[PDB]
């Protein structure tokens, strides 16, 4: 087939990521997204069951992919000689968890509560099947704007989910663990839970707590909004120095602060105008 099955549209973004275009499959005009990925710029390869050298995100993305679409899923993807073309899913209206903080500051509880329960359910899913994301945070989420659904975004830095330590990381340093900055050691979960911490905070007070590894290690939280006590409770349990200290996903389900959730067609309509 090659490219004569997508039309290729404005490029939306490029970074550490590669470059995404929007595009539009011509078979039945359903949104796409196009991300190119240089081969000389990967640096976590694997392989596909079939036996074939693709990049590890590819890998990740295949096993995340199918019926919770909590996950922008991977619908396809070429091979070029310097380069990997990944066709992804696309919404639209759509806007990532960063610019929507940006343009509106920190979110009121109730809408950050809809959205933080849905990263939750997004992660377990992953971890579900045997993948770890590694990068979580407001620029690796999307917005569906109508309905209000949020979706996980960019593997690359992701890794096959484990028990045993890991050693190697190449997601966001303000988003990292403790145990990372001083032993560069961690485990799959807590250090999830540990960027969840950082996601939650930045969601009700408008941005991040840490920005120095120095303030990373200290532990202390302060808070510039006003946020609730179970709110701010479980922020401060998430970002529990000892990894042990800190909650499971179900914990965090279970939490106080995290009941009465709004279903994300509510949350659109009452917050997103929609």
């Given at each position: 087939?090659?490219?004569?099955?997508?039309?290729?549209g404005p490029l939306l973004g490029s970074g550490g990521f590669g470059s995404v275009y929007s595009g539009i499959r011509v078979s039945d005009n359903l949104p796409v997204?196009?991300?190119?990925?240089?081969?000389?710029?990967?640096?976590?390869?694997g392989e596909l069951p079939n036996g074939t050298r693709v990049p590890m995100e590819v890998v990740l993305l295949k096993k995340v992919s199918s019926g919770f679409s909590g996950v922008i899923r991977l619908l396809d993807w070429f091979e070029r000689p310097d380069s990997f073309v990944l066709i992804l899913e696309r919404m639209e209206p759509v806007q990532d968890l960063f610019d929507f903080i940006t343009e509106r500051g920190a979110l009121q509880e109730e809408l950050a509560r809809?959205?933080?329960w849905q990263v939750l359910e997004a992660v377990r899913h992953c971890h579900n099947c045997g993948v770890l994301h590694r990068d979580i945070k407001d620029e690796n989420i999307l917005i569906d704007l109508n309905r209000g659904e949020l979706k996980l975004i960019d593997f690359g830095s992701g890794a096959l989910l484990k028990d045993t330590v890991y050693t190697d990381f190449d997601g966001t340093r303000v988003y990292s663990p403790p145990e990372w900055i001083r032993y560069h050691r961690y485990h799959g979960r807590s250090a999830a839970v540990w960027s969840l911490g950082i996601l939650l905070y930045d969601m009700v007070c408008g941005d991040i707590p840490f920005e120095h590894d120095e303030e990373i290690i200290r532990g202390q939280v302060f808070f510039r909004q006003r946020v609730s006590?179970?709110?701010?409770?479980?922020?401060?349990?998430?970002?529990?120095?000892?990894?042990?200290?800190?909650?499971?996903?179900e914990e965090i389900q279970n939490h106080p602060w995290m009941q009465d959730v709004l279903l994300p067609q509510e949350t659109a309509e009452i917050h997103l105008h929609s």
């Open positions: 087939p090659l490219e004569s099955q997508y039309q290729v997204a196009i991300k190119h990925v240089e081969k000389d710029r990967i640096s976590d390869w809809s959205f933080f006590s179970e709110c701010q409770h479980l922020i401060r349990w998430c970002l529990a120095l000892r990894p042990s200290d800190r909650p499971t996903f």
